[PDB]
Structures are given as C-alpha cells and as structure tokens.
Design an enzyme around this catalytic site. Structure first.
Site, short mmCIF file in Angstrom:
data_model
loop_
_atom_site.label_atom_id
_atom_site.label_comp_id
_atom_site.label_asym_id
_atom_site.label_seq_id
_atom_site.Cartn_x
_atom_site.Cartn_y
_atom_site.Cartn_z
N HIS B 8 50.25 45.15 31.70
CA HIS B 8 49.30 46.02 30.94
C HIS B 8 48.38 45.13 30.18
O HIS B 8 48.61 43.93 30.02
CB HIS B 8 50.03 47.03 30.04
CG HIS B 8 50.81 46.43 28.92
ND1 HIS B 8 52.15 46.07 29.01
CD2 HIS B 8 50.51 46.30 27.59
CE1 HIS B 8 52.60 45.67 27.81
NE2 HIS B 8 51.59 45.78 26.96
N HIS B 67 36.96 38.27 29.03
CA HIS B 67 36.36 39.45 29.70
C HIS B 67 37.29 39.91 30.77
O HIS B 67 38.02 39.11 31.36
CB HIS B 67 34.91 39.44 30.16
CG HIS B 67 34.58 38.65 31.38
ND1 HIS B 67 34.07 37.38 31.30
CD2 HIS B 67 34.63 38.97 32.70
CE1 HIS B 67 33.85 36.92 32.55
NE2 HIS B 67 34.27 37.87 33.41
N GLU B 106 33.47 44.03 33.07
CA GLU B 106 32.62 43.78 34.20
C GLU B 106 33.06 44.66 35.36
O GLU B 106 34.28 44.89 35.53
CB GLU B 106 32.78 42.28 34.61
CG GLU B 106 32.14 41.86 35.89
CD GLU B 106 32.44 40.42 36.26
OE1 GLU B 106 33.12 39.66 35.52
OE2 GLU B 106 32.02 40.04 37.40
#
Lengths: 130, 130
Positions: B8, B67, B106
C-alpha cells in the site's frame, strides 16, 4: 477508463551509491540501469527510479508525508527485522524504517482485506463501504 | 526472501473530503473505508491510505522528493488530460499533476522495458544491466 496499475515510483536521493546498496543488496532488488544521477531497479515487481540530488539539505526534515509499504510473508518477519538491524538501517505485523535519506518505508504481512476485517472489530465506528 | 509486491501507499492530506473527491471521482478509485481522519481506497489495484493532518502548512513547499506514476493505455491520454483539466487539477507519453495537497502524480503510457529500450537509443552512455 480506469487507471490500470501502478507504473513506477520515483525518489530523490543524496548519494546514488548508498541508495544502490540499500535497494539492491539490503532489500534484494535488481539494478537495471545507471547514469551519473539516475538508477532504476525492479523491487517486488515494481519499477523504482532514483534521481540523485546531492543538495537536498541534511539538516531539515523531509519525506514526512508519504510512506510506501511492501508485502512480506508473516514467517519472514524476524528474518527481515534482523536483516535491517544487522545493516544498521533506521528502524522506527509491520516493520517501519527509512532508506538512507529518510524516505519512509514499511514491510507489512497482511492484505487490505485483513486490515478491513481488523478495523471492523477494533474500530467499529468507522464506516465501511461495499 | 524477496519482497513479494507493493502492499500500500499512504499519504497525509489536509482535507479528507477534497481528497476523497480527487481519488474517487476524478481518478475513479473505490472508497473502502472512512474514519474521522482516515480514508482507504483501492485505485489501479493498489491500496491507498489517506491520513488527515489539517495542520500541514499551506505556505511551504512539501512533497518535492517523491512521485508515483500509474499506467494508462496510450489511447486514453487525451481522455485523461481533458478529465484532469476539466476538474481544474494542477497539471505540470506522460501527464504530470498533483493531488489537492501537492502530492506528485503521473499518468504514463509505457513499461519499464519500453523505457530501457528508449534510453539505450536516447542515452547510450548509461549503463544497462542484465
């Protein structure tokens, strides 16, 4: 048009060689590429990209608001705890730790389903959605 | 004893209701649980946990060094770009954007294999590992 899967994770790191040792030897990932300021691994079936940024300040707190957890088998808990301790990793059903820069990581032995069923008993005033 | 899979991801967020709208309506994830300061989703087959921290300063830069990218089909690129633009998402083969707090995300249309083969042509002075 749903999102299909997780594609990759990218982290900024201060020292590529220290991070390669962490991800590839300590965590047993596979090094796939390097440049002067980049390294790619495959770890736990996931593409991880590292970007070297030598100027991230060491005298400030960063990385506070995200953590990434990886699955291990329950029976491997003591193996992993000992491995991280024996490699002087910063350790804070789960093992919480950081990479050499401070990115927050976790090893967890359960599933989302397990966790939902746990909270239905432990935290029954939460709201559970079908 | 390798790590098996990603388990997770957890993010801290300032306003749970704004983040539920983002992850569940805009990104089409599934809301599974809420508490006063928590929400769990399944998005792209991944468990995402949100922890509400109402005091993360709004007048400072955070979230700079990580990211997370999700896979979409190439043909869905314009659909997703338009969806994010029409929902006033902060947009910066990839679409780069942030959640309401600034966590960097992204959408990417390729694989790790694609990227390695791209760099073998575009950046041939990198080192590629078997």
């Amino acid at each position: 048009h749903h999102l299909k899967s997780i594609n990759h994770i990218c982290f900024s790191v201060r020292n590529l060689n220290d991070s390669i040792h962490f991800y590839r030897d300590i965590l047993l990932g596979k090094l796939l590429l390097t440049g002067k300021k980049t390294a790619y691994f495959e770890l736990a079936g996931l593409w991880i990209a590292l970007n070297e940024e030598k100027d991230i300040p060491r005298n400030e707190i960063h990385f506070s608001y995200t953590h990434i957890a990886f699955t291990i088998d329950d029976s491997e808990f003591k193996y992993w705890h000992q491995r991280l301790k024996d490699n002087n990793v910063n350790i804070l059903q789960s093992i919480y730790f950081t990479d050499p820069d401070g990115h927050k990581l976790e090893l967890h032995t359960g599933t989302l389903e397990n966790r939902l069923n746990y909270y239905k008993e432990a935290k029954p005033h939460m709201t559970f959605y079908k």
